[PDB]
Design a protein around this ligand. Structure first.
Ligand code: CLA
Ligand code: CLA
Ligand code: CLA
Ligand code: CLA
Ligand code: CLA
Ligand code: CLA
Ligand code: CLA
Ligand code: CLA
Ligand SMILES: CC1=C(/C=C/C(C)=C/C=C/C(C)=C/C=C/C=C(C)/C=C/C=C(C)/C=C/C2=C(C)CCCC2(C)C)C(C)(C)CCC1
Ligand SMILES: CC1=C(/C=C/C(C)=C/C=C/C(C)=C/C=C/C=C(C)/C=C/C=C(C)/C=C/C2=C(C)CCCC2(C)C)C(C)(C)CCC1
Ligand SMILES: CC1=C(/C=C/C(C)=C/C=C/C(C)=C/C=C/C=C(C)/C=C/C=C(C)/C=C/C2=C(C)CCCC2(C)C)C(C)(C)CCC1
Lengths: 193, 64, 161, 41, 733, 31, 97, 75
């Protein structure tokens, strides 16, 4: 059901889990622990994509360029990275990347070292400063989370494929192009030219 | 009785047999106490030596 | 051009080979009377060569260094007639033959003396099996999906490990 | 005629007939459609 | 009663000449000797390895000594492109005066052999210049071999014999061999290149007496320890540099130019130094992977157990493979020989297209000989790898411990593997042979335009992706807008593109329909030889015809004429049958290489491009055409320096036919004939006084097969070597 | 330059010693 | 480019990574893998006198169990990273993407 | 039989078969080289197998091309 009405569900996907629409044509979740790992990885990927989409749309909307050209400073020698127009004095190539490595390694290590799978997916505690877990609307909130998350995941994949399709162009500029000639500039320009 | 009924179709579980995973017809089963391979099986196709029959114990024959 | 190959229409080596073959045939012809049968045979040869080379030129064949048509088998749309189209025709014919042979074997394993049917072919049975090969791919897909095409590994003789 | 038809249905006789028919077909095709390296379509 | 085969009681008690043959032929099968313990087996193998190392070093020291004593190494170095190298002097009492004066080449005072091993170019590249240098090297290698002999004797003594557990310490051995044997050795070699070879190629003379005085770089070890390594690449050698001469030389010791040296048509010495330094760093890092004694590293067994797919498609995965591999020396030998054969093929394929030695590309006969040598060595090594895999299955494979792991799954679906190899071989053979016969018939009927000439567009696309602009695909270093081209245009592409767009060398030769057909023939040969070898390896333990083949061993004659006949039913017989196919495949490979390079060197590549598409061209324009000078080595009108190669050509033909004799007539004829001859000797007067001690018997079936195979292979090798050298040296082109 | 007779005899003596060591190793492998 | 500063920073960063964020993971993995085993038992248990773990050299008083061998390993990684950084900065190679 | 027929062919092409001119000069197909070349196995390889096989391998494109085709097919 759900993803395909009338379709029999696989046994390992009963439907109780958030976002469980029974979509598994390749049977990747047959092994239970692999299924739990896939749930965790789906949540992490979805959260990263959620946080990534505004970091792609807002800077382009404000005139600071698209996301594909966001690393374009690093490609040139002496890029002098910028933030909201203001240059970043510590934005040389051999310091920001090391800082990224150390900090992300710390957060990744703290996350990797928690036994309970439920807290591996939804830790809570210090990550809920505004509550949002005392109420009874928690499960549907998880469902909303996974729904916006898969939506943003497909959105970022669209960003990437459009980056290959039209190099030097941003997703919002592609939206403008579609609004300009919706019946001449579509995906057909790439797959059937 | 000892093994399968006469005329029944039996499948061979002997790994070293030419007819492993093949079906044959039971011809006779000997009830003498002491015989190790009493079941006689006839096969539709011959082996390399040209023999189309063999003897098996009931534990290495299964019912279809 | 698809690996630095010029089209054979404007290939100088192709025309040189045309000229050389025609000249050789005419040299062989000079030693026979015009009305003689050997002269007719050689003139038929000349016409055959001329039409062969015109046909090769008209289909946009790719000639390399000197005149020799080269075949492109990478799937290019301009060369589908070299390997993909005849390849598909071959696949249809070969699959026909194999499928009808398999069907005949199936239909003679239920006979009382199959070996006699293999050494002495049941021509009516064989012919009405052969007639079924027209739509062989559909039957093959149907048997594959239904599970009647592939024997289960539990019923196949294997040697000890 | 039963025995004659049975003999004619034997493997070698039928192979001879079938392969001769195939060879004649191919030879005649080459008579009318010779020296082709490309399937025209 | 303790006769010659002291390691086999059964052979010692054989009263026939079979005892001698089998004692000779079963000496090194240590596991089969009577009263053999694993400890003694390992120690004997260790000492035999020491002996082999000593023999190898003696062989190279003898090469050095003979080149120093009877060679023209100095004269060759003064003028490499117009001096023929000398291998060694000839003292044959059977020569006549014409033979004495025919073999006086290379500016010698008597008959000499002209070397075709490339040792002159190799030693000139690595800095050796005079005969005293070669003599010192030979003496040093004599000392090294003596040291290895001393070590081999020493580790066999009671108080220095290693234990079995020491021999099974896989992690420590890998760590030491990756770090020191591979990494530190390469570091030392790049140190040699920096200190000796490069200064020698730039006119400086650095020896042991001034190693600590000669400065490899003007800024010595300053920028190395300051992190500014670019200083070691600021001043590369110019294109006007002359090897061994200070004119046009530079000061950089670790460059990254790529391509070839314009004057020697070989790789730059600084590029090779940087290569060896980089791989030394990588190998030394890699050798710190496994856990030996310090609590850090990896457990290889646990790595193997951990690597099992959760879906069960591979079964239990690699569980139990560590013990199976560490306990079985035949598995290790098979893996080593597989890797060594692949790497030998790589060496052969990379040294002809990327010559590392100065003035080696100009030496055409040396290049051809080196390629053929290493390709045949690689083929033999691959056959050995598969044979030892079969021996592993027969003697060392335990299904109990290897239960449902990858090896058991290979044994389970072996019929599928063999059937698909059969299909691939059949398809390749049918279609390649049919295309060749089609082309033959079209050339025979005078209509070459009707050939089926298939353009190798996939390999040409790869060539374009490597920078070849001849085919006009314009992608991946053939296009300016490609990101790979932009990334590489600063470092190697200036040299690499220049070298690959030069058609005068063998770097990515132009290919056509003949190249397509011959590569498909090569694929046929590889697939068929692999089919035979894998079938032997996987049917070694048993089959439907012989379910209990494992109890009969690896090499047994047959199982008698019962069950329809069981000739060549052993896995050793599969190896016997695959040796013919590997010989054929390497013959095809070397035939292609040799013809392609003859037509490249002579400058008329049109002959190959037009004649290689049909087999009559192969017979006439390659075999018949290039053998004219070979067969005229000696004739009624005289003889020349190619007489030895003509004689070896005929000799190889004769040995090939004698191999035919041992392969066709099988045993019984000769046993009856020997019976008759024994009667004759026993009944002849003045000769029945002389009596044999070993009863003369005909050769056994397995022995007959092996002797016929040896004759066949020796004839193959000698005939082709004679033809190759005679046709590449009679016309230096 | 060309090697001398002293060098030749040094090489011969070294080879003789290596042969002695080889015979020793062969006798050690034998038993 | 400052050699001393880069080397010190890289070595300190990788030592910190090995001491605080990666030490528990490395400990768990060495506990899971354990000593290499020859056939059922360890190499030393099989009779290899030279395969015994060097306990004297592995003794440490660091509260987290950081050993001098671990110090050497993480310092080697840090020096490798620092020299990679120094060689790439002092390179002059600009792909200009 | 192979050696017998090879001996016949070489001896006839060398010493018997040939052409006579008006003056009376007899030239032979091979040139009378059997007396000095048949004594050597290299002579058989070169002056008979290599020299006299030049026509079967160069017969392509002519009425003798079938002989070259069957030469290779028999191989
Ligand atoms: C996955 C998270 C993510 C990542 C990796 C980035 C990465 C980046 N952003 Mg984006 N961004 C994000 C989320 C993210 N952003 C979100 C959620 C917002 C909304 C608040 C923005 C809004 C935003 C703006 C408005 C701008 C960037 C810019 C940048 C770039 C400059 C570095 C920087 O932020 O300096 C920050 C440095 C310190 C905090 C120190 C860099 C490529 C700048 C850019 O495009 O310049 C090239 C820029 O102008 N970001
Ligand atoms: C709209 C998407 C969405 C939704 C519905 C949820 C919902 C939930 N999350 Mg998830 N989460 C998301 C996105 C989302 N999250 C993203 C993008 C991240 C990465 C930063 C996380 C990281 C995260 C962690 C680490 C944890 C949760 C937890 C929770 C639960 C309690 C908090 C809550 O009710 O959120 C309500 C969410 C909203 C009302 C969305 C409001 C949007 C705000 C205002 C930001 C938008 C600003 C701007 C447009 C984007 C710029 C980014 C900004 C940060 C600079 C609940 C199931 C906790 C949990 O389940 O434990 C019990 C928990 O431990 N989430
Ligand atoms: C919900 C996510 C999302 C959204 C809103 C869009 C929206 C758009 N895409 Mg993107 N796209 C997406 C996902 C998405 N795409 C994904 C997942 C892929 C990978 C298959 C692509 C690959 C893609 C390409 C290659 C191109 C677009 C293009 C377009 C635009 C016109 C074609 C069209 O109607 O879309 C059709 C979308 C799909 C069929 C999917 C439009 C602005 C075109 C464009 O920008 O032209 C101006 C274009 O060339 N998209
Ligand atoms: C596997 C190797 C191989 C391959 C691929 C070919 C391929 C070819 N050869 Mg070569 N040949 C080979 C081996 C091979 N030959 C060998 C071993 C020999 C030595 C005996 C020869 C000797 C040889 C000669 C002497 C000649 C060829 C010729 C040909 C060509 C056409 C032959 C022919 O009858 O076409 C005609 C086409 C057909 C017979 C079509 C098939 C008809 C069947 C009945 C199908 C009917 C239609 C079907 C039911 C419906 C399909 C779908 C529809 C839409 C089309 C073709 C390029 C001839 C040629 O033209 O050279 C270029 C030619 O003169 N070959
Ligand atoms: C039957 C076996 C066999 C034979 C007879 C040959 C014969 C030949 N090979 Mg081939 N080869 C073979 C197998 C064989 N090869 C295999 C299996 C491989 C794959 C690994 C190769 C790979 C190979 C390459 C890559 C090259 C040759 C070359 C040569 C030629 C030079 C002679 C030679 O090897 O120097 C004999 C030399 C030695 C025995 C000394 C080798 C010892 C090295 C230097 C050890 C270095 C470590 C050092 C001691 C560490 C320092 C310690 C400390 C200071 C740190 C000669 C034609 C060379 C060539 O063609 O040049 C013209 C060449 O470049 N061969
Ligand atoms: C194992 C290999 C090896 C060995 C034993 C040596 C040994 C030596 N090198 Mg060499 N070197 C090597 C590899 C090696 N190097 C490599 C791979 C490079 C390239 C980075 C160099 C580059 C190099 C330079 C540039 C210099 C040395 C110098 C020296 C000497 C140092 C003396 C001292 O401490 O003061 C000594 C003879 C120095 C020297 O000779 O000082 C007089 C010197 O200036 N070496
Ligand atoms: C690292 C390399 C290596 C090592 C250590 C071994 C070690 C071993 N092999 Mg393996 N093998 C190797 C490479 C190796 N082989 C290669 C490359 C091949 C492929 C050719 C083989 C093929 C092979 C087979 C097929 C068999 C072995 C066997 C054996 C074992 C006994 C060998 C024996 O009796 O020796 C005694 C040595 C001989 C009998 C060789 C005699 C000389 C041969 C015939 C060549 C002579 C040529 C010619 C006459 C000389 C030149 C003449 C000149 C005029 C040109 C032993 C464990 C046997 C075994 O395990 O038995 C169960 C076995 O059956 N090996
Ligand atoms: C030129 C000599 C020659 C040829 C053609 C073959 C051909 C073959 N061998 Mg054999 N083999 C040979 C020499 C040869 N071998 C020698 C010297 C040895 C060493 C003892 C071996 C050892 C050997 C082994 C050990 C194995 C093979 C295998 C194969 C097959 C490989 C697949 C292949 O090429 O399919 C294409 C088929 C061919 C090239 C065969 C010829 C097809 C003809 C030309 C078509 C029919 C023409 C015509 C209609 C017939 C007219 C006759 C009559 C009706 C008038 C194939 C049947 C392997 C095998 O069978 O695997 C499947 C295998 O296991 N061979
Ligand atoms: C029987 C057996 C045996 C033996 C076996 C053998 C002998 C095998 C072989 C095998 C082999 C002989 C293999 C090979 C392989 C190869 C491969 C697998 C390859 C790969 C490649 C790649 C991957 C590539 C990549 C690339 C390229 C393409 C180029 C550029 C660069 C790069 C890198 C990207 C033993 C004893 C073990 C045991 C039992 C079983
Ligand atoms: C000087 C002199 C002289 C003389 C001298 C001489 C005579 C010398 C000789 C020498 C010699 C005569 C030498 C030899 C050498 C040899 C060697 C060095 C060898 C080696 C070998 C090895 C090392 C090994 C072997 C082996 C084998 C083969 C098998 C078994 C095992 C082994 C591995 C052990 C004179 C009188 C003139 C005078 C003066 C003095
Ligand atoms: C007392 C203490 C402390 C501190 C300490 C420290 C800070 C230590 C450090 C230590 C260290 C800091 C160590 C290090 C180590 C390192 C190493 C071990 C390295 C190695 C390296 C290498 C080996 C390299 C190599 C190379 C390169 C990279 C360049 C050139 C080339 C080559 C390749 C040679 C404190 C206050 C916290 C308190 C507590 C305790």
């Amino acid at each position: 059901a759900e993803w395909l009405p009338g379709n029999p569900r696989p046994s390992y996907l009963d439907g109780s889990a958030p976002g469980d629409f029974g979509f598994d044509p390749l049977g990747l979740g047959e092994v239970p622990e692999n299924l739990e790992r896939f749930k965790e990885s789906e949540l992490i990927h979805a959260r990263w994509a959620m946080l990534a989409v505004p970091g792609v749309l807002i800077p382009e909307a404000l005139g600071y360029g698209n996301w594909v050209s966001a690393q374009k400073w690093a490609a040139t020698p002496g890029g002098q990275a910028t933030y909201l127009g203001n240059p970043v004095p510590w934005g040389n190539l051999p310091v920001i990347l090391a800082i990224e490595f150390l900090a992300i390694a710390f957060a990744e290590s703290q996350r990797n070292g928690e036994p309970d799978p439920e807290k591996r997916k939804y830790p809570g505690g210090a990550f809920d400063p505004l509550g949002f877990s005392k109420g009874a609307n928690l499960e549907e909130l998880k469902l909303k989370e996974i729904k916006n998350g898969r939506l943003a995941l497909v959105a970022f994949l669209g960003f990437a494929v459009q980056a290959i399709a039209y190099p030097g162009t941003g997703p919002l500029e592609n939206l403008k192009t579609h609004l300009a000639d919706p019946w001449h500039n579509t995906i057909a320009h790439v797959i059937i030219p | 009785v000892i093994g399968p009924k006469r005329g029944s179709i039996v499948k061979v579980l002997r790994r070293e047999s030419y007819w492993f995973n093949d079906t044959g017809k039971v011809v006779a089963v000997d009830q003498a106490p002491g015989v190790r391979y009493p079941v006689v099986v006839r096969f539709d196709k011959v082996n390399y030596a040209g023999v189309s029959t063999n003897n098996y114990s009931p534990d290495e024959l299964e019912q279809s | 051009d698809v690996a630095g190959l010029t089209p054979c229409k404007e290939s100088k080596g192709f025309a040189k080979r045309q000229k050389q073959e025609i000249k050789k045939l005419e040299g062989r012809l000079k030693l026979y009377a015009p009305d003689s049968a050997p002269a007719l045979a050689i003139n038929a040869t000349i016409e055959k060569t001329k039409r062969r080379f015109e046909f090769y030129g008209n289909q946009g064949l790719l000639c390399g260094t000197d005149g020799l048509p080269h075949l492109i088998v990478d799937g290019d749309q301009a060369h589908l007639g070299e390997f993909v189209y005849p390849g598909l025709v071959f696949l249809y014919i070969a699959g026909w033959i194999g499928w009808v042979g398999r069907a005949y074997l199936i239909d003679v394993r239920t006979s009382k003396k199959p070996t006699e049917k293999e050494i002495i072919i049941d021509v009516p049975l064989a012919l009405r099996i052969m007639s079924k090969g027209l739509t062989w791919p559909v039957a093959a897909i149907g048997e594959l999906r239904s599970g009647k095409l592939v024997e289960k590994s539990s019923n196949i003789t294997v040697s000890p490990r | 005629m039963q025995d004659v038809k049975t003999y004619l249905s034997t493997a070698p006789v039928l192979a001879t007939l079938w392969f001769g028919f195939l060879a004649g077909l191919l030879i005649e095709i080459n008579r009318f459609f010779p020296d082709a390296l490309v399937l025209p379509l | 009663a303790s006769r010659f085969p002291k390691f086999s009681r059964g052979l010692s008690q054989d009263p026939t000449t079979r005892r001698i043959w089998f004692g000779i032929a079963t000496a090194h099968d240590f596991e089969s000797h009577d009263d053999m313990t694993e400890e003694r087996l390992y120690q004997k193998i260790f000492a035999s390895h020491f002996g082999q190392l000593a023999i190898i070093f003696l062989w190279t020291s003898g090469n050095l000594f003979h080149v120093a004593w009877q060679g023209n190494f100095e004269a060759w170095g003064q003028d490499p492109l117009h001096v023929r190298p000398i291998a060694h002097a000839i003292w044959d009492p059977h020569f006549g005066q014409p033979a004495v004066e025919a073999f006086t080449r290379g500016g010698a005072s008597g008959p000499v052999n002209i070397a075709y091993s490339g040792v002159y170019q190799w030693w000139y590249t690595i800095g050796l210049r005079t005969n005293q240098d070669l003599y010192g090297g030979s003496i040093f290698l004599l000392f090294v071999s003596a040291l290895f002999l001393i070590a081999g004797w020493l580790h066999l003594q009671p108080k220095w014999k290693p234990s079995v557990s020491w021999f099974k310490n896989a992690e420590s051995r890998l760590n030491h061999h990756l770090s020191g044997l591979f990494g530190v050795s390469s570091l030392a070699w790049t140190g040699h290149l920096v200190h000796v070879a490069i200064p020698e190629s730039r006119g400086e003379h650095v020896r042991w007496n001034n190693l600590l005085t000669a400065l490899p770089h003007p800024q010595g070890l300053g920028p190395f320890f300051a992190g500014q390594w670019n200083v070691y690449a600021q001043n590369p050698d110019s294109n006007s540099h002359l090897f061994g001469t200070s004119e046009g030389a530079g000061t950089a010791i670790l460059t990254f130019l790529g391509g070839f040296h314009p004057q020697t048509q070989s790789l730059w010495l600084t590029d090779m130094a940087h290569h060896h330094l980089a791989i030394a760093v990588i190998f030394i890092i890699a050798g710190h992977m496994y856990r030996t004694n310090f609590g850090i590293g990896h457990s290889m067994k646990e790595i193997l157990e951990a690597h099992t797919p959760p879906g069960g498609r591979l079964g239990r995965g690699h569980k139990g493979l560590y013990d199976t591999i560490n306990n079985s020396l035949h598995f290790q030998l098979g893996l080593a020989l597989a890797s060594l054969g692949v790497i030998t093929s790589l060496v052969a394929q990379h040294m002809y297209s990327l010559p590392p030695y100065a003035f080696l590309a100009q030496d055409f006969t040396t290049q051809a000989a080196l390629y053929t040598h290493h390709q045949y060595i690689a083929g033999f090594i691959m056959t050995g790898a598969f044979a030892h895999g079969a021996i592993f299955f027969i003697r060392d494979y335990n299904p109990e411990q290897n239960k449902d792991n990858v090896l058991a799954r290979m044994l389970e679906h072996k019929e599928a593997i063999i059937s698909h190899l059969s299909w691939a071989s059949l398809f390749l053979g049918f279609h390649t042979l049919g295309l060749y016969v089609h082309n033959d018939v079209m050339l025979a009927f005078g209509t070459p335009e009707k050939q089926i000439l298939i353009e190798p567009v996939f390999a040409q696309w790869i060539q374009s992706a490597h920078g070849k602009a001849l085919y006009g695909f314009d992608v991946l270093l053939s296009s300016a807008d490609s990101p790979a081209f932009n990334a590489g245009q600063t470092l190697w592409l200036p040299g690499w593109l220049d070298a690959i767009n030069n058609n005068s060398n063998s770097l990515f030769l132009t290919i056509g329909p003949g190249d397509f057909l011959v590569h498909h023939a090569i694929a046929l040969g590889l697939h068929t030889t692999t089919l035979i070898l894998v079938k032997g390896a996987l049917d070694a333990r048993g089959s439907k015809l012989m379910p209990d083949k494992k109890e009969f061993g690896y090499s047994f004659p047959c199982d008698g004429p019962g069950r329809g006949g069981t000739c060549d039913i052993s896995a050793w017989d599969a190896f016997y049958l695959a040796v013919f196919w590997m010989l054929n495949t390497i013959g095809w490979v070397t035939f292609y290489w040799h013809w392609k390079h003859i037509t490249l060197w002579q400058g008329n590549v049109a002959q190959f491009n037009e004649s290689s598409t049909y087999l009559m061209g192969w017979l006439r324009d390659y075999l018949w055409l290039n053998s004219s000078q070979l067969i005229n080595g000696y004739n009624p009108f005289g003889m020349n320096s190619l007489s030895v190669w003509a004689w070896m050509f005929l000799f190889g033909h004769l040995v090939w036919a004698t191999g035919f004799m041992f392969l066709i007539s099988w045993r019984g004829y000769w046993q009856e004939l020997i019976e008759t001859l024994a009667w004759a000797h026993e009944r002849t007067p003045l000769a029945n006084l002389v009596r044999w001690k070993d009863k003369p018997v005909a050769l056994s079936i397995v022995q007959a097969r092996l002797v016929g195979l040896a004759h066949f292979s020796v004839g193959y090798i000698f005939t082709y070597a004679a033809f190759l050298i005679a046709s590449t040296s009679g016309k230096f082109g | 330059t060309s090697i001398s007779d002293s060098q030749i005899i040094v090489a011969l003596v070294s080879a003789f010693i290596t042969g002695i060591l080889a015979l020793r190793l062969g006798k050690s492998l034998y038993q | 480019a400052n050699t001393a500063l880069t080397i010190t920073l890289s070595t300190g960063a990788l030592l910190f990574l090995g001491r605080f964020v990666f030490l528990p993971f490395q400990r768990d993995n060495v506990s899971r893998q354990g000593l290499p085993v020859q056939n059922g038992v360890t190499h030393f248990d099989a009779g290899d006198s030279r395969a015994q773990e060097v306990t004297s050299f592995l003794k440490t008083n660091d509260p987290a169990g950081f050993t001098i061998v671990d110090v050497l390993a993480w310092g080697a990684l840090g020096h490798a990273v620092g020299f990679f950084i120094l060689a790439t900065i002092n390179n002059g190679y600009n792909p200009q993407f | 039989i192979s050696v017998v027929i090879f001996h016949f062919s070489w001896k006839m092409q060398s010493d018997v078969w040939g052409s006579i001119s008006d003056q009376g000069v007899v030239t032979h197909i091979t040139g009378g080289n059997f007396a000095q070349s048949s004594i050597t196995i290299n002579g058989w390889l070169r002056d008979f197998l290599w020299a006299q096989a030049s026509q079967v391998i160069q017969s392509y494109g002519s009425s003798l091309s079938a002989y070259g085709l069957l030469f290779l097919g028999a191989h």
